[PDB]
């Protein structure tokens, strides 16, 4: 049975990233913006049924649901050249264009208000899946829809699909700029709470690090959201490369997750991508990916806390000599180029894959690194400190008290602070040799 | 080739419309309890039907004369011209006649079930509903049987025969191709001694179908008794179809050392068909208890 | 443990899986049939279908020159 | 044996569909506008042959308004039909989308109509019955259609009465505020005096034409072209001798296993503009059926009632053209194995395939075309929608003054209420047939 994944694109950023992801997938699979198979893609070796649905007319329709509480973005997708790729009947958009106002509690209450429409859509799409594996939510924990509505959907999905996986592509906001939303840390903490209790996997996409990368490595002065989303779509393509090119091993998401997330609470995965360059041996590829200046996630390199890699998987796409792969692994081990978790065995995997035949690749070889590395705790600590910094001033709480989640008290905020403390503490235990016994 | 196409039209009932008119007239005479075994009646109707469209074939086609067994005694005479009579021996003509008879029996059951109007039983509530369910069951079974026979036996053997006759360069090759086509038809028609059991099971189900059609024509007044007789016959036919599916699994267990892909294909068509026969013969059986 | 029908049902399931994965266009699935070593075929039986599972490959002419029976046995192993 | 069928084209829609049908038939059979074959089809089923080798449609054109009859007599196909077999009411006012008024008009023109019907019956060697192409929402096809249905059921109680009944758009506001009353009276007459009513929903036909033919805003001309395509597919077994389902009796018996459950859903294939040259892919029976099975290409708007677990009762695919029988078997197998269809709970999954030849005179870009007739309980959702529209009008007494003026509603509205009850029972029975309790 196919293992279908439903992509939920939440709010402006989630919907735009989902649209660009589907555009990239179309280009890699040779599917027209109208859903028509391009002549050059008739002999493809890709399994589309995992992430796309195939219409009876050989039309490939994204298994993507675009949810926004404001019409502007949904209309922009339906007005794009790719408007015909998605089934329009699987798209629910709230007519009340007032949004969640960047408030997690408001997004949650809106998810509750539109629960029936959303769960009816989700159930229709699930019944249209032979063996739906789960949902991948592309959202921000800091926004309104992706945070509030995302938490509501996380709760309702946890109740409705208790056997389906919940993966998130959670875009973290830029930490270095003053957010115009002073409560953004509160929304993010509430979303992290819901991820902690009701989500199976959170992939952290830090917009601050993406901007830093665009400036330092892409030489993009003031990177636009479009360029960031192009990098994101490249990452999503690399994450779907094992789906898009049929291989012999790790052909399912279950094996990937079990290889990447050994601790259910420790489900925050770091990403690495290669090449990340503006317009080669396996060992040289892996060494470049291993260069800290090429990691696309801002995790603090605390020198006091011996952060370590929990696991690394390098998916290398293109013509790769396996003997060079073996030699590269040997050289990396001998050079101790990576510090691994002390409480478990070093999981370092290398997958060789073929590129899509439909996408022109200027690079004979690309690579993605997925890494579970303890320096993410520095990100969680930063988020906790930002939350505590906002809560300590009781700033802008009069509007929170207007919302039901904060109308009586902030206990959900205090629980979120506790959960983030527990996450930090678990990361520290994983920093210790006794973590295996922790 | 023209003679072979005529042979297909008449002996194989490929003249679909003419064989339709023939079997309709035969089923009508059977229903009227008229002497359909009358050689003069059958010959007159055959000669008229053939003379209207194919005067040359009209001269070569002739009709000679359990409900299902009501048509037993009809002999079709196809006048093969010289020198082709050297190839189409009287034994070949007998085999063609046997295939024609099988096709005619199947067409007769088909027409008898299709012509059955709901109003003839309605003008003649739970008994009516049970009879409707039995009708739907018989229709599913008969439609599956007709399609299976037509496509897997008749259509497949006709296409194979046409291709082999086209490729045949020699008269012995042509004779062998024709004999292979005939043998394939006879096997799909269950005429092989090894399939007599399955033929008998099919004949029992057809007889239950004919009794069902007669009880449908007898109307709701007979339906109180008909519900019990239909339910018993449909229960026994569902049991028979299940017994024949289990016997096909036993025969596949015994035949894994005995290669017969076409009996395998027959059983692959019958397993859906046999399970539908069983489930739908149970529909008449569930309304007499 | 395998039965005399397990191979048939498994091959049907394999065709269904090809359809589920849009492998319907491969003229090769009809050339490929999963076989089951079943001691009940003579009328120790494998305690499970996994233990009973074999593979058949429809070698076409002239390649049967290359795919000798010993090669197919090694491939089965 | 031939089974002659007289086609009765009733009202604006029926007459326009008949005109486009005759044009399409002429083009598909290579028949001139005068009924002469242009330089192997059995015409006698739908056409009569004159002594001069002229092929005349076995078609009776009945309209209560002169406009359509005059348009037909001004059409290129005017010479195909015998002008003496056309009765037209001098009162060109029609029934105004009122079943009761159309019925009273049918009663008023009974003699002219039954004289035409008898002339056509005598022109049939083995007349099986009459097929009326009419709308249930119009005046003539609904009201006069109901009158003619009554008179045909009385005169030919052993002959089949098939209707191609065009149902008004359920999703659009009917211009006839009394349309629900007219529809209920027509449904009553279909239920009591017609053997089979094929519901043709113009809304669903437009949706199908847009989704599958890529027709932006399908015109009435394109809808009538689809109707003519349907009629051609229905006569394809007459024009091309096939191996199975060569008669209408057999079609009906394959479609209606339950005499009360005689409401048929339609499916047509291909529903594509001739410009869709599907690249060099041998469409297999399984691939064809899979393409036909896409809901966006189904030409019937059935409601997704969440309360009724609708199911397919039966599906017949009549495939005309070069079809591999092994591919037909494979197509049935693939449909069952993939559980691509939910079937009736009260019976075995009925999937029939009829093999037919294409017309040799009509150019087919597609080696194989198909019509699907499906009995599917979600059609009950369409009947439920129609019932809800009826109940919406009856509960508001909307547009009832004209019914109360008409004899069918002159004393009471009991015929409308009985029709609403019958349609409710039909919806409930369709749900029960999706249910173990259908019995």
UniProtKB/TrEMBL annotation, chain B:
Q: Which residues form the Gamma tubulin complex component C-terminal domain?
A: 1-219
Signal peptide limits = none
Q: Where in the cell is it found?
A: Cytoplasm, Cytoskeleton, Microtubule organizing center, Centrosome
As for family, the record states: Belongs to the TUBGCP family.
Question: What does the UniProt record say this protein does?
Answer: Component of the gamma-tubulin ring complex (gTuRC) which mediates microtubule nucleation. The gTuRC regulates the minus-end nucleation of alpha-beta tubulin heterodimers that grow into microtubule protafilaments, a critical step in centrosome duplication and spindle formation.
User: Which proteins does it associate with, and in what oligomeric form?
Assistant: Component of the gamma-tubulin ring complex (gTuRC) consisting of TUBGCP2, TUBGCP3, TUBGCP4, TUBGCP5 and TUBGCP6 and gamma-tubulin TUBG1 or TUBG2. TUBGCP2, TUBGCP3, TUBGCP4, TUBGCP5 and TUBGCP6 assemble in a 5:5:2:1:1 stoichiometry; each is associated with a gamma-tubulin, thereby arranging 14 gamma-tubulins in a helical manner. Gamma-tubulin at the first position is blocked by TUBGCP3 at the last position, allowing 13 protafilaments to grow into a microtubule.
**Protein's name in the database:** Gamma-tubulin complex component
Q: Which organism is it from?
A: Sus scrofa
The taxonomic lineage of its organism, from the top, reads:
Eukaryota, Metazoa, Chordata, Craniata, Vertebrata
The gene for this chain is TUBGCP5
Q: Which residues of the full protein are shown?
A: 718 to 1042 of 1042
Automatic annotation (TrEMBL), chain C:
Q: Which gene encodes it?
A: ADAL
The portion of the full protein included here is 383 to 477 of 667
Q: How does it assemble?
A: Component of the gamma-tubulin ring complex (gTuRC) consisting of TUBGCP2, TUBGCP3, TUBGCP4, TUBGCP5 and TUBGCP6 and gamma-tubulin TUBG1 or TUBG2. TUBGCP2, TUBGCP3, TUBGCP4, TUBGCP5 and TUBGCP6 assemble in a 5:5:2:1:1 stoichiometry; each is associated with a gamma-tubulin, thereby arranging 14 gamma-tubulins in a helical manner. Gamma-tubulin at the first position is blocked by TUBGCP3 at the last position, allowing 13 protafilaments to grow into a microtubule.
Q: Which domain of life is it from?
A: Eukaryota
- The organism is Sus scrofa
Q: What does this protein do?
A: Component of the gamma-tubulin ring complex (gTuRC) which mediates microtubule nucleation. The gTuRC regulates the minus-end nucleation of alpha-beta tubulin heterodimers that grow into microtubule protafilaments, a critical step in centrosome duplication and spindle formation.
The protein depicted here goes by the name: Gamma-tubulin complex component
Location relative to the cell? Cytoplasm, Cytoskeleton, Microtubule organizing center, Centrosome
Q: Family, per the entry?
A: Belongs to the TUBGCP family.
Automatic annotation (TrEMBL), chain D:
Q: Which InterPro entries match?
A: Gamma_tubulin, Tub_FtsZ_C, Tubulin, Tubulin/FtsZ-like_C, Tubulin/FtsZ_2-layer-sand-dom, Tubulin/FtsZ_GTPase_sf, Tubulin_C, Tubulin_CS
Matching entries from Gene3D superfamilies are given as:
Helix hairpin bin (1.10.287.600), Tubulin/FtsZ, C-terminal domain (3.30.1330.20), Tubulin/FtsZ, GTPase domain (3.40.50.1440)
* Listed GO biological process terms: cytoplasmic microtubule organization; meiotic spindle organization; microtubule nucleation; mitotic cell cycle; mitotic sister chromatid segregation; mitotic spindle organization
GO MF terms held by the record = GTP binding; microtubule nucleator activity
Q: Which CDD domains does the entry link to?
A: gamma_tubulin
Q: Which family does it belong to?
A: Belongs to the tubulin family.
Which PANTHER family does this UniProt record tie to the protein? TUBULIN
The protein's name is: Tubulin gamma chain
Native source organism of the sequence: Sus scrofa (Pig)
């Amino acid at each position: 049975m196919p293992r279908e994944i439903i992509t939920l694109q939440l709010g402006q950023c989630g919907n735009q990233i989902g649209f660009e992801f589907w555009k990239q997938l179309c280009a890699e699979h040779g599917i027209s913006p109208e859903g028509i198979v391009e002549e050059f893609a008739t002999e493809g070796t890709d399994r589309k049924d995992v992430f796309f649905y195939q219409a009876d007319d050989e039309h490939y329709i994204p298994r993507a649901v675009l949810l926004d509480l404001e019409p502007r973005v949904i209309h922009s997708i339906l007005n794009s050249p790719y408007a015909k790729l998605y089934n329009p009947e699987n798209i629910y958009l709230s007519e009340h264009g007032g949004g969640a106002g960047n408030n997690w509690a408001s997004g949650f209450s809106q998810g509750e208000k539109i629960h029936e429409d959303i769960f009816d859509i989700i159930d229709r799409e699930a019944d249209g899946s032979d063996s739906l594996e789960g949902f991948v939510l592309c959202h921000s924990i800091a926004g309104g829809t992706g945070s509030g509505l995302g938490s509501y959907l996380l709760e309702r999905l946890n109740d409705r699909y208790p056997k389906k996986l919940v993966q998130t592509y959670s875009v973290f906001p830029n930490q270095d700029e003053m957010s115009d939303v002073v409560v953004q840390p509160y929304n993010s903490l509430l979303t992290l709470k819901r991820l902690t209790q009701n989500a199976d996997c959170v992939v952290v996409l830090d917009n601050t690090a993406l901007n830093r990368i665009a400036t330092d490595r892409l030489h993009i002065q003031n990177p636009s959201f479009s360029q960031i989303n192009q990098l994101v779509s490249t990452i999503m393509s690399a994450s779907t490369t094992t789906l898009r090119y049929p291989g012999y091993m790790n052909n399912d998401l279950i094996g990937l997750i079990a290889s990447l997330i050994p601790t259910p609470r420790l489900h925050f995965l770091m990403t690495g991508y290669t090449p990340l360059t503006t317009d080669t041996t396996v060992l040289d590829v892996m060494r470049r990916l291993l260069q800290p200046k090429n990691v696309m996630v801002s995790t603090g390199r605390d020198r006091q806390t011996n952060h370590c890699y929990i696991a690394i998987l390098n998916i290398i796409q293109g013509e790769v000599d396996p003997t060079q792969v073996h030699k590269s692994l040997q050289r990396i081990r001998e050079r101790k180029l990576a510090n691994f978790i002390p409480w478990g065995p070093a999981s370092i995997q290398v997958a060789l894959s073929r590129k899509s035949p439909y996408l022109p690749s200027a690079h004979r070889v690309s690579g993605l690194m997925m890494a579970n590395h303890t320096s993410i705790s520095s990100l969680f600590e930063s988020s906790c400190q930002q939350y505590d910094k906002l809560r300590k001033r009781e700033a802008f709480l009069e509007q929170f008290r207007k919302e039901d989640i904060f109308k009586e008290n902030f206990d959900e905020l205090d629980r979120s602070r506790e959960v983030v403390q527990e996450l930090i503490d678990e990361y520290h235990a994983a920093t210790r040799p006794d973590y295996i016994s922790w | 080739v023209e003679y072979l196409q005529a042979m297909r039209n008449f002996f194989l009932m490929e003249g679909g419309d003419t064989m339709y008119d023939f079997y309709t007239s035969i089923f009508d005479k059977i229903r009227e309890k008229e002497t359909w075994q009358n050689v003069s009646f059958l010959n007159v109707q055959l000669q008229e039907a053939v003379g209207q469209r194919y005067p040359e074939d009209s001269s070569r086609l002739s009709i000679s004369f359990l409900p299902v067994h009501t048509l037993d005694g009809l002999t079709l005479s196809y006048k093969v011209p010289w020198p082709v009579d050297i190839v189409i021996s009287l034994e070949c003509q007998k085999i063609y006649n046997q295939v024609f008879l099988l096709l005619l029996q199947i067409k007769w059951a088909k027409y008898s079930l299709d012509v059955l109007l709901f109003g003839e039983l309605a003008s003649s509530r739970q008994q009516i509903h049970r009879m409707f369910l039995l009708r739907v069951k018989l229709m599913h079974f008969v439609n599956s049987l007709h399609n299976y026979i037509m496509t897997r036996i008749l259509h497949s053997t006709g296409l194979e025969f046409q291709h082999q006759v086209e490729e045949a360069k020699d008269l012995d090759q042509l004779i062998k191709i024709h004999y292979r086509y005939l043998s394939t038809i006879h096997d799909r028609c269950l005429l092989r001694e090894k399939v007599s059991f399955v033929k008998e099971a099919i004949m029992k189900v057809l007889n239950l179908a004919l009794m069902f059609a007669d009880g449908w024509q007898a109307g709701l007044g007979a339906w109180h008794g008909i519900s019990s007789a239909v339910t018993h016959g449909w229960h026994g036919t569902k049991l028979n179809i299940f017994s024949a599916v289990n016997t096909s699994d036993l025969i596949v267990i015994h035949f894994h050392h005995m290669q017969l892909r076409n009996r395998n294909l027959f059983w692959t068509v019958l397993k859906p068909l046999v399970y539908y026969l069983d489930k739908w013969i149970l529909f008449p059986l569930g309304i007499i208890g | 443990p395998p039965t005399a029908v397990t191979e048939h049902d498994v091959n049907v399931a394999f065709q269904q899986s090809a359809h589920k994965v849009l492998l319907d266009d491969d003229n090769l699935l009809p050339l490929l049939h999963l076989t089951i070593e079943y001691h009940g075929k003579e009328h120790e039986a494998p305690a499970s279908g996994w233990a009973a599972l074999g593979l058949s490959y429809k070698v076409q002419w002239p390649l049967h020159i290359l795919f000798t029976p010993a090669v197919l046995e090694k491939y089965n192993v």
